[PDB]
Amino acid sequence: MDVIGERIKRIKEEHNSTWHYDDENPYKTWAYHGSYESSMINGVVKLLTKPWDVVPMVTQMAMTDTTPFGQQRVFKEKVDTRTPRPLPGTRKVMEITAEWLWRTLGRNKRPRLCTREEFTKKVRTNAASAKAAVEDEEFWKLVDRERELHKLGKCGSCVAIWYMWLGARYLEFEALGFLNEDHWFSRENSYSGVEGEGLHKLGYILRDISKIPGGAMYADDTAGWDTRITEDDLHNEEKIIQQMDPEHRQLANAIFKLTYQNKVVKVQRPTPTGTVMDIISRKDQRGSGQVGTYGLNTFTNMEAQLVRQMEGEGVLTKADLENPHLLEKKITQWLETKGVERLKRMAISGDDCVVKPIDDRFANALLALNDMGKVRKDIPQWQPSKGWHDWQQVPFCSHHFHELIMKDGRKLVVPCRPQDELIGRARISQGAGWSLRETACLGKAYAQMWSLMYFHRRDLRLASNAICSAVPVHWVPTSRTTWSIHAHHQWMTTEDMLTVWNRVWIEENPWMEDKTPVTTWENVPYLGKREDQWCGSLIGLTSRATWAQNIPTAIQQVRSLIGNEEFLDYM
Ligand SMILES: [Zn+2]
Ligand SMILES: [Zn+2]
């Protein structure tokens, strides 16, 4: 590759004091040119969740393997592998579907550049430490310089000096940020997308899909989705440039060509001498850390599922996939007549998908899915997918969903996951060197999230009150509970939680017809005991009963360690 030398010659330039090329490199498809050369437990939450001191899943999450072994062997194992090129017929159909999809996605919207001001706003609020750069003119000078490089068809630093990484990310956000900021994959615009809907809506969306007449609901994982993105996928995602103004088109074509279709990655290797870092390149796959990775994964997944549905419906044959002169017409006619309707049968979030086809031939439509490189996880290539007849069974975005019948007769659809995962996560604190205060506040953060998202789990509501009772009323929850793009962080507030519960689940809930306020937590429903239990609850156990009865004691213990602040009783 010619158009790659600049970044190869730059890291060579600074790191010449240790530079060489190793003959013992574990890179068999990642082309190689050279190489050079801590997270505690939340004490508050733990104290109030004693019965979970034992639980294996809880213990497992309280273990972090990040530095010495856990990313040198993990982020390297099944990544340096190839994907066979899709057949020519497959390639044609994909190309038509991508053309049609971009056109559809852009029917009401025009692509535009995002701005320094927009990027500043987002960095300040924490979204999707780096502040120093953002209030620094020099940073924007470096940004401007690399932009002039991109404009000329060249790339310098898109791989303190932390300014280059962020710089790269901004330019990316500048050329492709519109996909998120202008909501291209919101349900209203994308039909299959759920971007910006929020976790508290995902269940309602699944239930609406369940009402569409058809076969079962399918939700196959892809084994390492990002590793499965082909050169062909990348070229189809690029078709979005056609809709851009000349000035935007340049900057975008730069991003795709230089950082998507021709990447330069830095990664460490355990060379038995010292801590070394390798520099490698590849024409395909996806790098997670990129702004707009989500947009393009949602896009390619949407396309992929449309192709599977097409095969399911008999539009695509093995013969069609092999045909280097496959005719466009039947795909075009399928897309133009049935395209949108088939998108309405789907919920897609990056590599997460749920699909409800018109019948169950879909279960066996595997030719194209396999040939496209999107091989399902933990299943023989050619075994039909398991479908679910109950939408409540369907996994999506680490959750499943339940319908609840409130005492007043109304219904809620609520997010849920095995309780140990919830408690295990709350019991962890990201990073060492925290005071009790910052620790108490992260707990409250989790506690209030549980009262808005998982209030229907008996144990988590009790733990929730316990935490809120032990932490001063006026202390503001800080630091996030999750990085999920589906989280709207309504729990990050000193506003009383039943007021917020009412805003989220009654007032602003478009699926709630009757707007009558809930005046007490006693009218906020639980999962049935039975379901609560199958989802991990400890209700019924005596250790849980003891903890419940003896919770006031531990609350007081936490209280006297915090000091003579203002407390409220939530039990
Ligand atoms: Zn660059
Ligand atoms: Zn559940």
Residue 38 to residue 376: CA distance in whole angstroms: 34
CA of 428 to the centre of ligand 2 (A): 22
Q: Which ligand is nearest to the CA of 531?
A: 2
Query: Could you tell me if 274 and 370 lie in one domain?
Result: no
Query: Could you tell me if 378 and 455 lie in one domain?
Result: no
At 126, which CATH number?
1.10.260.90
Tokens of 293: 């990775």
Query: Could you tell me if 104 and 149 lie in one domain?
Result: no
Tokens of 550: 């003896």
Query: Could you tell me if 200 and 340 lie in one domain?
Result: yes
Query: Could you tell me if 221 and 297 lie in one domain?
Result: yes
- Residues with C-beta atoms within 5 A of ion ligand 2: 416, 535
For the chain, how long is the longest CA-to-CA vector?
Answer: 79
Q: Nearest-5° angle of CA 207, CA 213, CA 215?
A: 90
Query: Dihedrals φ, ψ of 77, to 5°?
Result: -55, -75
Q: Which ligand is nearest to the CA of 454?
A: 2
Which DSSP state fits 236?
H
38 near 292, Cβ under 8 Å?
no
114 labelled as ligand-binding? no
- Taken in order 182, 183, 185, 186, the sign of the CA dihedral is negative
Residue 29 to residue 6: CA distance in whole angstroms: 22
Closest listed residue to residue 408, CA positions, set 331, 308, 321, 517: 517
Distances from the Cα of 148 to the Cα of 11, 14, 258, 400, angstroms: 20, 22, 14, 47
Q: List b or e across 255-264, with b for residues whose CB sees 16 or more CB atoms inside 10 angstroms.
A: bbbbbbbbbb
567 near 473, Cβ under 8 Å?
yes
Neighbours of 142 (CB within 10 A): 19
Kind plus residue range of the DSSP H or E element containing 370: helix 367-371
CA of 306 to the centre of ligand 2 (A): 30
Q: Nearest-5° angle of CA 508, CA 511, CA 512?
A: 70
Q: Nearest-5° angle of CA 292, CA 293, CA 298?
A: 100
57 burial via Cβ count (<10 Å: 0-12, 13-18, 19+)? middle
488 labelled as ligand-binding? no
For 451, half-sphere exposure in the C-beta direction (CA atoms, 13 angstrom radius) is: 30
Residue 366 to residue 377: CA distance in whole angstroms: 13
Q: Within 456-541, where are the H helices?
A: 458-470, 497-502, 529-534
476 near 448, Cβ under 8 Å?
no
> Alpha carbon 244 to chain centroid distance?
27
Query: Could you tell me if 340 and 416 lie in one domain?
Result: no
Helix (H, G, I), strand (E, B) or coil at 546: helix
The count of structural domains within the chain is: 4
Resolution expressed in Å = 2.6
Strands 400-405 and 411-416: what pairing?
Answer: antiparallel
468 labelled as ligand-binding? no
Which DSSP state fits 452?
H
Which DSSP state fits 239?
G
Find the Cα–Cα–Cα–Cα dihedral 448, 453, 459, 461, rounded to 10°.
40
CA of 154 to the centre of ligand 1 (A): 7
Helix (H, G, I), strand (E, B) or coil at 107: coil
Query: Could you tell me if 26 and 130 lie in one domain?
Result: no
Query: Could you tell me if 62 and 100 lie in one domain?
Result: no
Neighbours of 32 (CB within 10 A): 16
Distances from the Cα of 239 to the Cα of 56, 96, 99, 325, 342, angstroms: 48, 11, 7, 21, 22
49 near 427, Cβ under 8 Å?
yes
Domain end position, chosen among 366, 397, 428: 397
456 labelled as ligand-binding? no
Neighbours of 503 (CB within 10 A): 14
Query: Could you tell me if 28 and 53 lie in one domain?
Result: no
205 near 197, Cβ under 8 Å?
yes
Distances from the Cα of 510 to the Cα of 141, 184, 405, 489, angstroms: 46, 21, 17, 19
Residue 366 to residue 229: CA distance in whole angstroms: 17
Instruction: Spell out the residues 6+ positions from residue 189 whose beta carbon is closer than 8 angstroms to its own.
Output: 105, 108, 109, 183
At 22, which CATH number?
3.30.70.2840
Closest listed residue to residue 552, CA positions, set 534, 566, 570, 530: 570
Distances from the Cα of 118 to the Cα of 173, 207, 288, 464, 502, angstroms: 10, 35, 22, 36, 31
Query: Dihedrals φ, ψ of 24, to 5°?
Result: -105, 35
Residue 11 to residue 20: CA distance in whole angstroms: 12
Query: Could you tell me if 444 and 498 lie in one domain?
Result: yes
Residue 111 to residue 246: CA distance in whole angstroms: 11
Query: Dihedrals φ, ψ of 35, to 5°?
Result: -150, 155
332 burial via Cβ count (<10 Å: 0-12, 13-18, 19+)? middle
453 near 200, Cβ under 8 Å?
yes
Domain end position, chosen among 338, 366, 397: 397
For 10, half-sphere exposure in the C-beta direction (CA atoms, 13 angstrom radius) is: 14
Residue 438 to residue 463: CA distance in whole angstroms: 19
Closest listed residue to residue 101, CA positions, set 335, 285, 271: 335
Tokens of 141: 């000078």
CA of 558 to the centre of ligand 2 (A): 30
Closest listed residue to residue 312, CA positions, set 357, 262, 277: 357
Residue 492 to residue 481: CA distance in whole angstroms: 9
Helix (H, G, I), strand (E, B) or coil at 34: strand
Residue 171 to residue 376: CA distance in whole angstroms: 34
CA of 396 to the centre of ligand 2 (A): 12
Which DSSP state fits 257?
I
Residue 263 to residue 159: CA distance in whole angstroms: 7
Residue 231 to residue 495: CA distance in whole angstroms: 49
Q: Which ligand is nearest to the CA of 418?
A: 2
Query: Could you tell me if 439 and 483 lie in one domain?
Result: yes
> Alpha carbon 128 to chain centroid distance?
10
Indicate the length of the chain as a whole number.
Answer: 571
CA of 260 to the centre of ligand 1 (A): 11
Report the amino acid identity of residue 298.
T
Structure determined via: X-ray
For 183, half-sphere exposure in the C-beta direction (CA atoms, 13 angstrom radius) is: 10
Unique residue bearing structure tokens 């924007």: 140
416 labelled as ligand-binding? yes
504 near 200, Cβ under 8 Å?
yes
Query: Could you tell me if 219 and 250 lie in one domain?
Result: yes
CA of 372 to the centre of ligand 1 (A): 29
Rg of the chain over all Cα atoms, to the nearest angstrom = 26
Domain end position, chosen among 397, 426, 460: 397
CA of 142 to the centre of ligand 1 (A): 11
Helix (H, G, I), strand (E, B) or coil at 142: helix
Q: Which ligand is nearest to the CA of 417?
A: 2
Which DSSP state fits 36?
E
Q: Which ligand is nearest to the CA of 260?
A: 1
Closest listed residue to residue 548, CA positions, set 459, 471, 467: 459
Residue 342 to residue 219: CA distance in whole angstroms: 15
Give residue 1's domain range. Answer: 1-37+68-81+156-159+261-283
Report the amino acid identity of residue 231.
E
